[PDB]
Amino acid sequence: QNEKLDHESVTQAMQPKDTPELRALYKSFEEESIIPLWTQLGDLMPIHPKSKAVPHVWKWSTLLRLARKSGELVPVGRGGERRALGLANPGLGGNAYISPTMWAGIQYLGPRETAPEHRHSQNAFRFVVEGEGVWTVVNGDPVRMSRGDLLLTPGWCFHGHMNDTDQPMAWIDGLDIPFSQQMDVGFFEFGSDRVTDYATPNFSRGERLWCHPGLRPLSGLQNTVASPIGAYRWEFTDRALTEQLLLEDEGQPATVAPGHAAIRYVNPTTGGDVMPTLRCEFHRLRAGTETATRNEVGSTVFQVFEGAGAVVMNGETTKLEKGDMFVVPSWVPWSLQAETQFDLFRFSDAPIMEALSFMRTKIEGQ
Amino acid sequence: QNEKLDHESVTQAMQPKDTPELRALYKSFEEESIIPLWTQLGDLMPIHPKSKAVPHVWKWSTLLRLARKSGELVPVGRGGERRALGLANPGLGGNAYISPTMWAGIQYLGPRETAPEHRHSQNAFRFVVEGEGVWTVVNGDPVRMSRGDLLLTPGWCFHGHMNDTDQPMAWIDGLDIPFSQQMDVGFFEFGSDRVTDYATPNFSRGERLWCHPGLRPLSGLQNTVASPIGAYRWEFTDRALTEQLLLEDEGQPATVAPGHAAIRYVNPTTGGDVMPTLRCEFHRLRAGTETATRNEVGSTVFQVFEGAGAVVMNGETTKLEKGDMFVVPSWVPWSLQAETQFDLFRFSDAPIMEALSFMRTKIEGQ
Amino acid sequence: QNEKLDHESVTQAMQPKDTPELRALYKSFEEESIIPLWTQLGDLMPIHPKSKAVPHVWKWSTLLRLARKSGELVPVGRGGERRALGLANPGLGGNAYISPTMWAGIQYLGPRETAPEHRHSQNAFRFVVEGEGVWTVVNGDPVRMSRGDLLLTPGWCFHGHMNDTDQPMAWIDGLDIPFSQQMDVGFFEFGSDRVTDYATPNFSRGERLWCHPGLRPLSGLQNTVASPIGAYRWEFTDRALTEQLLLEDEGQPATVAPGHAAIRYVNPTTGGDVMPTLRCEFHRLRAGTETATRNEVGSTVFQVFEGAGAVVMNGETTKLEKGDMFVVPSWVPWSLQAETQFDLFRFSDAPIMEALSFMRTKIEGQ
Amino acid sequence: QNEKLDHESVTQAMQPKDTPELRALYKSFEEESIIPLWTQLGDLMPIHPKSKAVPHVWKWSTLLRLARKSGELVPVGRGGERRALGLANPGLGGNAYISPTMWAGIQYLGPRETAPEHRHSQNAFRFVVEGEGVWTVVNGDPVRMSRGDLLLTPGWCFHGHMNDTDQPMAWIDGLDIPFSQQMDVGFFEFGSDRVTDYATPNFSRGERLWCHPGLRPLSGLQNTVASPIGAYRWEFTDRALTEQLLLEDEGQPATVAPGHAAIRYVNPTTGGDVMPTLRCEFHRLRAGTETATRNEVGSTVFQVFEGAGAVVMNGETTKLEKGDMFVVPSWVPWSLQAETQFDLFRFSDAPIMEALSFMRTKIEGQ
Ligand SMILES: O=C(O)c1cc(O)ccc1O
Ligand SMILES: O=C(O)c1cc(O)ccc1O
Ligand SMILES: O=C(O)c1cc(O)ccc1O
Ligand SMILES: O=C(O)c1cc(O)ccc1O
Ligand SMILES: [Fe+2]
Ligand SMILES: [Fe+2]
Ligand SMILES: [Fe+2]
């Protein structure tokens, strides 16, 4: 009976008589920094999530144009720290937030530039749809950046970046900046003005210790809150996804849904998410795959890595190409449709929702 | 060297030449929903937390006057749901938030009133500095409300309240409403218009199963995300705190600091916090005790339960009496000073900060 | 097909030709400390557990006679340490083991005696069906021993005992002595020759900190591997079990099965078992209750605390009275039958089996 | 004072007068299945672990001779199940136990033989110092066996083995058979008489899903009690150990001690041990390395994989060659000395000791 009621259809039984005494009470509320629940229940406590953030798509071709022009006109260095352009959700009041929890940006580093070293409580990762040439130095450990690589920079790790070539590179940054600003957890420290090691090894020290499947160094027996892997290289991700599709061909369980291969990047000390606030995945859909529509608590962002296809959000189809980016705010129904084989990088605030027992998932047909 | 720099003293090296091409770039950013990092680094990523919320104190005598007047002029019922007055931080832009994460309110239920049944993903607790007469029915289990009691209503539990007497009662509510609204995790369901059981037992079913020290029913071997204890009664809290002070008198370790007894209300299935987002404590300071100044990540709220004393926040002393309430936003230096024996109820968002590895603590002298 | 085969009915296909060369091979095995699998598969790896321990019952009246006579003839003191009589399973080859994992003993302390202080890696508890007068001093904290009390002495805690009266007292000890001896984990240290504190408070320091339901001292926020509660007093256990039966009367879920109230004694820092190797429970069956037959991996021991009834093991009924003790070895089918209201104390090695993922449970009808 | 006392030097104060009444008491103890503590304290509860197992070394050349001769004279098949020769500790009374917890055996499979399919609660792994040709089929998933590979068969997984060539292969088995027999946790089921899949892929399905560093299939988000990796191939182990030694050369932390590279094989869903009862490691010592002497609770076994060196146990040096095996019982002081670069495979019961909080470690110089 009452379970089908919403805030529009429910009887409003707390409507006081509009008298001078009531207006005086309400005036007194304002003077005393008091705001009654009864005038705002439905907004404070909706039937289901109703984000101020809206679903939205940014074209890579547009992001690249603006990043390149920024490369001409704006020098990178101290103070501003990075030449990064945050994707700003139209629904979030002028804040540089792609969602209420996450920052997503395109960053551009021109020939031979250095972005100086700093650290901050905010967790961060880099992802590269295309390019090479930059190394990012994380606690003194140079990490090469290449197409298809996920690079991590967990909170409070010193990091700076350098272009070792005569050619520009762009990539995307994800951070829990919006969550951290609203929740007041932000600390920041300036490090050196130049990265602490200009060497450019093929593979970082973190990788050389931690990227052997199923093996753990005896010197690393303590679990970490964030992954000690600095780089999740394209080769491994590509091979994982191929094997899932091959295993499917062979009638063996592997794919998460038919024609839908997918992995989660994990902290190898625990098997959990890469960082406390941020979950990263990579999806590969066979040509013609259409995912079942999901509603999920919290926000996610995808970047198209390869192939052609579309996303549906709130019933609306938007065609997508290589590098395009979209955000799905909390509880917005979404699905992906593959035209060709369709590869996507994904990040979300799901580790926050799951840690606090706020996660819910509705899946079409299930 | 660079570790002592802040956003005011650092060199700003990303100041572009102010030309028509630059203004055209910046205009293009606006059209494309792009906001560059370099114009806002320092605000997005402060050196240490700088909350928009400000420290603030609400007098119980004022809260009571406004709650009582609301009792005359505003009927309680469906739609508005509760006659509750939220403490609204002056720094939080007109939102009914005591801090960026927490709602705190005074609720008033007059003679023989019922507040109807509903549930919501938001976690909630009731605390009572004074009064008796109300029972709150939580998933059908009537729970008596009395002076000094902490009553819990974890997320998604049906709850409504009824005054069984001819006398009014007031109490405080705490909820993770602000966190839940900003993060988009809110669900809500209307239940019955009248509580489902009007019986008024001395002790609830939850208590009769779970409030025997060190004992666990074989029917309750599964751990819960929130405490199954609906009521943490004043008797136990009072006795715990007395025993700590007695143990101190006897030269035995017990108190958390000298003359400072304190407990945390816990989920007995895990030994952890009562609910995923909210931590509740109770403190008792010997006359003359002055706590060491703390900076802590995240916000806390205290209500004075008994005795006289003061709080210091940002170096500013405010004298406190029975029922007065104050909020300490993230990283604000705070201490308590006991004039007489000084009893306080405390809640905070610390389980959020600790789950996500954002907690930090600075203690004066340590 | 092959799933119904056992070691008696399976084809034995590794029967070598009995030749001089084979006997020479087998002789060589002996010289080289080699024992082939094929001559002993079925014994090493049975179809289901087949303990050398047998179900067995010890009469309290017999245990008391022998303990009392030991009180006359054997002095208690250093070296031998305790006047304790271990229940020795007839199936375990003369070892003083009630089961392959547990020691159970009756201990007797005469008027004004002291049993001196020591510690050992082996975990221990005391349980009292009857008597008063002894205090056990655990890390310097005197703990009163009374009828119905469970007293804990986790591994590596100094403990000694003293009779403060002119009257003898007996109780039962449980320890993981057999597990610890076979697995080679035993350490032992002699402490003082007399307990370190002869005071006899009603309640220990551990209890005064930890026995308030749902409350945790801020000085005790670190979780422990064993419970910091030294005494689980009869009052709480009795009240817990009564409330379950009352809740059942009221149509409310509480009892573990119909007419079967039961609790587990738990570590309040975690909600888990009292000690890493040993699980303690207390059961109360309504007159006429018959439990469903269980097979469970690992061994358990019960002592009858009050009332009359029977146990069935391997289909065999043995009538039981106050104080009688029985052991149920691994996978032996067992049930309890209540003649009157039937109260039993229970301990087991279940935390070992569950930690190592060896637990299985078969329940009749389910 | 009393801390330096042991069971040989302590005063024995419970020596009763040897009278007819005492001998009658003691006789009565025997009739009633009672064994007093005071006549056996020191044996039941030693000052530190004193295993019945003794340190011992088995020569690979001897193991190979006996396995090969067994290959001629004993057919492999149903009933006996495997042609495996257990290493029997001289101190363990004729039981086929290398230590009180572990079985270690050499298994031999001749040209074209099949060992039929079964499962058991006991956990198992295979390790190969030399050879190729056998596949082991684990829950229907064929897993190739090659030099340097660790193959897993967690408890209750169906497994059988087949030689796909005209050449014999030998390897070592480790199981928690002794623990499981003494603790009564053993279940066993006969599966098919022939393996269920004779195909011989280079890599199993488990590996194709789980052996990509830092990546987890979305279809495998549930944690497992044992590793889903069926094969830890030599390539990865070799590369891990090389990188540690290279990182050391570069002044970077990696090795567990100087010139001592080492990894632990882990469950990738948790970062923990491969199976609940058994820990597997692989060590590589630079020529000339001498490890610091350790005492550790519980037993370990090593097999020499490559190079030459020695072990010291109880102060006694034994020179070791490729394939030689040794056991170090609980609390025996041990160290390894590398003559050439010295590679060893290691297994132990450490996950049992650590789960139950019985682990202790003494390291020389630290
Ligand atoms: O360090 C970075 O590369 C960075 C990039 C961003 O897009 C936002 C904040 C950052 O600190
Ligand atoms: O149910 C309540 O009593 C309640 C009280 C508040 O102050 C705010 C939200 C609520 O749902
Ligand atoms: O300390 C004791 O009371 C004790 C009792 C036993 O029955 C066996 C071993 C012990 O250490
Ligand atoms: O299945 C095996 O290969 C096996 C090997 C052994 O050495 C002992 C028990 C077994 O079940
Ligand atoms: Fe950064
Ligand atoms: Fe509510
Ligand atoms: Fe003892």
Ligand SMILES: [Fe+2]
């Ligand atoms: Fe086997």
